[PDB]
Amino acid sequence: MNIFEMLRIDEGLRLKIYKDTEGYYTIGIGHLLTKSPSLNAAKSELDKAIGRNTNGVITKDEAEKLFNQDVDAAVRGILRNAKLKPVYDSLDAVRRAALINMVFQMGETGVAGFTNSLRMLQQKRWDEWAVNLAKSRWYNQTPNRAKRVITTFRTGTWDAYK
Known about the structure:
- It contains 9 helices and 3 strands.
- With about 160 residues, the chain is mostly helical.
- It has one domain (about 1-160): Orthogonal Bundle (Lysozyme).
- Strands 1-2-3 form a 3-stranded antiparallel beta sheet.
- A hairpin with a 2-residue loop joins strand 2 (about 25-30) and strand 3 (about 30-35).
- It is elongated and about 50 Å long.
- The termini are close together.
- The PDB classes it as hydrolase.
- Keywords: strain, stability, mutant, T4 lysozyme, hydrolase.
- The assembly is monomeric.
- The introduction of strain and its effects on the structure and stability of T4 lysozyme.
- The protein: lysozyme.
């Protein structure tokens, strides 16, 4: 299983624009179009992204291209972040994907805020770090997923996912 598989499972695959949980415009595999409401606002952005007039519908292939870019980009946000980079480096491979998953869902900034979390993590703490996480808005708005992610982190295994 890998990062790509991981998130594909968590974000699903939609070929036509749609509203997320927070009610945002999205398409593909978790690709956020606009923190706005103008459905046109959103087609424009889709247009800019693919580079074609899409009328709000794209291809699998295209959804996958957004995706790669999206996963890559998270990977670098982490490596550029001063607080995240090193956490990332200290972890094994599964746990890292988990990290990458988080960031994808909430941005380097969002993530790098777990100031506390931050090192328990690095301390090779979990458990305690985990409970902290269950006490967050994040967890409370998408528990299923949050759990699968927290589980993966704690355990350094893909159990939650199969």
